[PDB]
Symmetry: D2
Subunit: 330 residues, 4 copies
Amino acid sequence: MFEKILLSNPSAENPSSLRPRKGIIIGLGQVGLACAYSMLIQDCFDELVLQDIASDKLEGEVMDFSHGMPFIPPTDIKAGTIANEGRNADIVIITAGVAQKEGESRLSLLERNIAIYKKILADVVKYCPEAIILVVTNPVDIMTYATLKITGFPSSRIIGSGTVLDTARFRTLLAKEMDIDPRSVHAYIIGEHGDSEVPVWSTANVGGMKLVPNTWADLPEDEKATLSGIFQKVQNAAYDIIKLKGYTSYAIGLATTDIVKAILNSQERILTVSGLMTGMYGIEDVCLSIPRVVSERGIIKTVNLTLSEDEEKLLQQSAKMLKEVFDKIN
Amino acid sequence: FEKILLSNPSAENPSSLRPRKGIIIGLGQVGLACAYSMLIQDCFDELVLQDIASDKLEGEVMDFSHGMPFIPPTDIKAGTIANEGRNADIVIITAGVAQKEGESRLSLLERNIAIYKKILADVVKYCPEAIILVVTNPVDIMTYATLKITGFPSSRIIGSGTVLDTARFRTLLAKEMDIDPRSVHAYIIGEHGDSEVPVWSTANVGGMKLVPNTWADLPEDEKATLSGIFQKVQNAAYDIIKLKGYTSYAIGLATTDIVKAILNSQERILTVSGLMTGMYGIEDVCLSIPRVVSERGIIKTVNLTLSEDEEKLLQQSAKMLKEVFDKI
Amino acid sequence: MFEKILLSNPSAENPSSLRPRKGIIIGLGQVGLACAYSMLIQDCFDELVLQDIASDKLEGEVMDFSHGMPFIPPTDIKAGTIANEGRNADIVIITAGVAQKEGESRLSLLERNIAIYKKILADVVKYCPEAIILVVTNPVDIMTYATLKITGFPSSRIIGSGTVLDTARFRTLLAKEMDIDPRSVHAYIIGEHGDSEVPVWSTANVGGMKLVPNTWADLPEDEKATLSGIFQKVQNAAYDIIKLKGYTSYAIGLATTDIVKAILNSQERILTVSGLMTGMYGIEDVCLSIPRVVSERGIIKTVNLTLSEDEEKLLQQSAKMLKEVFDKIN
Amino acid sequence: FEKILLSNPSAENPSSLRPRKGIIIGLGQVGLACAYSMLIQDCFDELVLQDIASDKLEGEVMDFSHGMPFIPPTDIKAGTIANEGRNADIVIITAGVAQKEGESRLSLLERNIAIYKKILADVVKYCPEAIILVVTNPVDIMTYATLKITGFPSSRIIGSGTVLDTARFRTLLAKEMDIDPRSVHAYIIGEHGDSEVPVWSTANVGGMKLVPNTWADLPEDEKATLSGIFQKVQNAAYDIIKLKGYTSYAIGLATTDIVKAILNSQERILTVSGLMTGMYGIEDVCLSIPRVVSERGIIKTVNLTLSEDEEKLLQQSAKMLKEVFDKI
Ligand SMILES: NC(=O)C1=CN([C@@H]2O[C@H](COP(=O)(O)OP(=O)(O)OC[C@H]3O[C@@H](n4cnc5c(N)ncnc54)[C@H](O)[C@@H]3O)[C@@H](O)[C@H]2O)C=CC1
Ligand SMILES: NC(=O)C1=CN([C@@H]2O[C@H](COP(=O)(O)OP(=O)(O)OC[C@H]3O[C@@H](n4cnc5c(N)ncnc54)[C@H](O)[C@@H]3O)[C@@H](O)[C@H]2O)C=CC1
Ligand SMILES: NC(=O)C1=CN([C@@H]2O[C@H](COP(=O)(O)OP(=O)(O)OC[C@H]3O[C@@H](n4cnc5c(N)ncnc54)[C@H](O)[C@@H]3O)[C@@H](O)[C@H]2O)C=CC1
Ligand SMILES: NC(=O)C1=CN([C@@H]2O[C@H](COP(=O)(O)OP(=O)(O)OC[C@H]3O[C@@H](n4cnc5c(N)ncnc54)[C@H](O)[C@@H]3O)[C@@H](O)[C@H]2O)C=CC1
Ligand SMILES: O=P(O)(O)OC[C@H]1O[C@](O)(COP(=O)(O)O)[C@@H](O)[C@@H]1O
Ligand SMILES: O=P(O)(O)OC[C@H]1O[C@](O)(COP(=O)(O)O)[C@@H](O)[C@@H]1O
């Protein structure tokens, strides 16, 4: 209808040099919906395809998302699959999978989530051969490494959300103690997105002023206790939140969107995303988070970060464990 | 951290700038979509969240606060009107029972008035100068009841009304033309419900009307295609609730869009719900018609010329709403 | 020294599906520098090339623009030419040329500016064959038509800024009388961006409520005088501003950026931009402004706008005189 | 248009929400870029512009207001502190004489103080609760002068300082590394000018320090390339002015950034110029140092540990800044 209101221009039949930026979110539960909402409000994509096995709920969600378009800049939001609507998408965001129950480790979701990815990744390889894959499903590091092995895509284009979320939690907790903007706190969490994560106290600072002036050993006992209490709240954040509301979604939706921005907008910005360890600290054949330059080609550079002897030993231990967990699943 | 940041004794006295505080009462599906959108779009300097389900609320506040490094900051916290929410500039009330599958918004009235009588007592005492933005259904009658209970000026008692219905109408028409919904200028007025009125007499894109003369002078095949679009707007809540169980995302954006016109003193035209004091011979009821929204609430009303049929339908919607409130 | 700080990733040697959005502004005087500032603050492009014959001033401007990057999201801003840095740019924004003096007509700049365009467009055809050209130089309508003839590009990809600016002025003046947001005033100015522009009083409205309820003739004499005073301020805006500060730049910089947003973000949004007339109201072989759908392929659709008999006659007269002005120069 | 929009009599009484008003005094190259940036980034609800060149200001206000439909609205107008600018929350002063090719910032002091004494008298009388943001060079000495003439709490008198120089420093370093300038965390502190100090001891990217131990340990080829980059930072204004006549765009974005931390109550760390009250044994002078900025001005000060050279360089800068103020 409306062909007498708008007259089509036959000159616009051939496509110009500009190609719309397409994104696809596979798995639309609590995490996938938070990602979709944030990515629409922040206008990341020109077209966004949503893929889920729960058809009815998905159809309802797409209706709700599309009704709010007049309040924000537009995005062609639709329900679809990689094989048709999601073909040649620039970024594939995979959140699909089982979430952890109360007191359940992320590591115990591995067998079930590899089974889910085997069904999904085959179509990503055939219909999106040039895409960046952004993995959110837990255990995030091992799911990123398995995606790399299954797809055979270049390691630069296989990125896990990793410790971007853990770093944001560390900064928020420290910023609450100082009553400042968390964007002014520069503190990192590296390694596994889980129990073996490593706080980089050696470089933690606000406005260039370090929180640990010399070494952790030279810190007073009362100060060591208050800083450890802050880190323990970061490692227990998922357990504490899941015990209260049943899951986590808002902060991961913003962390995932923040990574999509560095890629889409070719920003060359440093983020602690998960990716193949290919030499540093003697770590190999594994994925974990360390500061890296992120842009339209994925991981383009890695910060050659100087760590303390204790921080490096902890990172090495995190990697050996992650490799053993993947080896046991065969 | 007292040896890392040195406090300034000069900052003890408060400057002319007072932080913009907002409070959301009712953190269910709708309230949590409002909170998420309002944080990403940086509406408030401080935002208080109030709910009777303490544990779940504490978990939600933890989750919201962990994403702050990715956006500009807002002091997000759990609290009550009596303490943390004192003198908030805008009170957004979404608390209450939502409609089940096939249920009418109108049949949720007695249940939500009981909830409102408990909430509104504290708002009158601790936020006497606040704008109240009502989202709880039936939105028009909840807005009218809030006006009677609080006794606040009618300009400061606003319902979300048909801002959402107007956005749905524009999206459906824009999908048919494959254009930006912000380029479609079509309104839905009256009750946010079954008796809503599409203003076909003024619907247009770029000044070009969709109904060139009158609805009667339109071909039968065109009348059927336009009616199909309006029917999809009135059945939107029923169609979405049947698929996912509730609606949250579009109302979260509509509510945020109203808070932007107020906080930023924009003087922008929106079809929000508010007290009718005479227009089209309609009074002692709340419903949606285009109005200028700003920091003092409803500042002006568009003296909209309607067709004889559109005016009769609006009058019928009002009589119906008045009868629903009178029965309770 | 920084090669030991950041370690390059050999996997990122091959380019992904994502290609950075490149734009080039040719002519960086008052208008061009307002466009560059707005487009940087609003983060339109991934890379933006600036081209001008005044090399020294341009080098200084690029230094200034690049120093403010830490306060906004990044853009690779650089000085260059179409032949090297500007190769395969998605949008070419041309603001180069002579501006009108006090009391001077836009039409009298035609001959001089076509001479400037002939030199510039030769490289645009060779190095940017797939680009959208956005023309701002005066007389914007005849300059858009001449660009079409010189380049031979599809008419959908040759767009003039047209009456987007005039429409914004009309809306602001009417909104000041009502004390409302100009974005809530829906009033159009169509035709030539100049003295023969046409106010579409037949459709001017706020919230669906028309300002002229029936016809201009059925309006009271006092109302006819107040509405005419508002339109006369719109046609005299350039003269009034140029007489006070010497030129106009800020509003055209925002109008140009608003057009770039509809193209880059594939918005399909209605704007009164200048473009080739193909028989609407019997008008052909001329460029002028009428409401059109703008997107990544340029002008995709045209609003089949119903005009009053007087408004249509005025639009037809505007086109006959624009055609005669171009014919006299050839 | 009284028959188009009907005014609401309830909106006559004002609410707890009051519009954010800012005034820019001195609308030349710098002030015009502050205004354009602030309008596009929707900082204030009302923005008044003040300049002695009335006809030119009238032209700029017509131009700025014509672009309003493209961005969120702001009440832009020409006026004076005594009428349109009364009770401004933030007063931004960029008025004064700029430097020529090769002219030192400090020599502009004697002339600019005279200009300021006329302006500040009305700021004290009609905006007694305002934050004053000083841009006029020599910025540091004009900030201390503003602090002395007005008598306002030290927290409310803020200078643009080395926020701009810090942004240039990060940009030049990020150019070498081919990364986002927001990922480089390096500071320039002290006087905005020749005696500025680059904090090499704390310069880093992603936690990784640019100077691993001390400057003296650096290989001679590495310390020459680093010195080269700092030489380009201190000579940036000279190099730009010789090429285009003045600087406007980068300061326009730096001033807008300081204003964003104030209006939105962000508590963000910026290297702004302010009163030294004992840090490094330095007082009765104004210089840049990392500070917490919010709606009350300077709220806190980073107790930054500096290298022995960095500290001695910073205090020498302060001793000579207080000598220039005494010669007046
Ligand atoms: N990386 C991180 O920091 C975080 C990771 N997560 C992880 O994200 C995952 C998702 O968790 P939630 O969203 O909370 O739970 P959920 O149960 O709501 O989400 C899983 C969704 O995936 C869908 N799904 C399952 N198999 C599918 C398939 N083959 N194709 C498409 N869709 C399919 C389900 O229908 C459901 O909608 C979990 O593994 C969780 O541990 C959660 C939070 C943060
Ligand atoms: N105006 C509109 O266009 C729309 C209105 N709505 C309405 O908004 C309301 C919110 O519904 P949902 O979020 O979908 O349902 P929900 O059941 O998830 O949310 C209700 C929330 O209110 C809380 N609550 C109840 N009584 C309370 C009290 N006395 N004080 C504080 N908190 C209290 C509950 O604990 C719960 O968190 C419903 O009435 C629904 O019909 C829903 C969609 C659009
Ligand atoms: N369409 C509209 O609504 C508006 C159009 N304009 C028009 O924009 C044009 C430019 O205006 P202003 O900035 O005020 O003039 P201007 O004199 O400030 O700048 C024009 C610039 O063009 C450059 N230039 C000239 N020939 C060139 C070439 N071959 N290649 C590259 N650069 C070249 C000059 O070096 C100069 O910097 C004029 O034609 C003016 O009438 C101005 C305002 C609004
Ligand atoms: N890093 C920094 O903090 C920077 C400082 N500046 C300084 O900003 C100042 C202004 O620079 P520009 O805009 O380039 O120069 P400009 O000469 O174009 O601007 C000065 C303006 O102030 C007006 N003015 C003079 N006395 C006035 C009074 N009593 N009341 C109101 N208006 C008055 C003049 O009419 C003129 O429009 C200079 O002192 C310059 O050194 C400039 C750039 C960066
Ligand atoms: O606090 P600084 O050193 O001025 O840097 C501020 C910038 O740092 C960021 O927080 C980035 O931090 P990181 O690079 O440490 O992750 C930006 O979002 C912000 O604009
Ligand atoms: O299509 P137009 O007439 O240029 O109007 C564009 C403006 O219309 C709006 O959609 C508002 O429309 P309404 O006033 O009809 O609600 C703005 O958000 C947008 O900026």
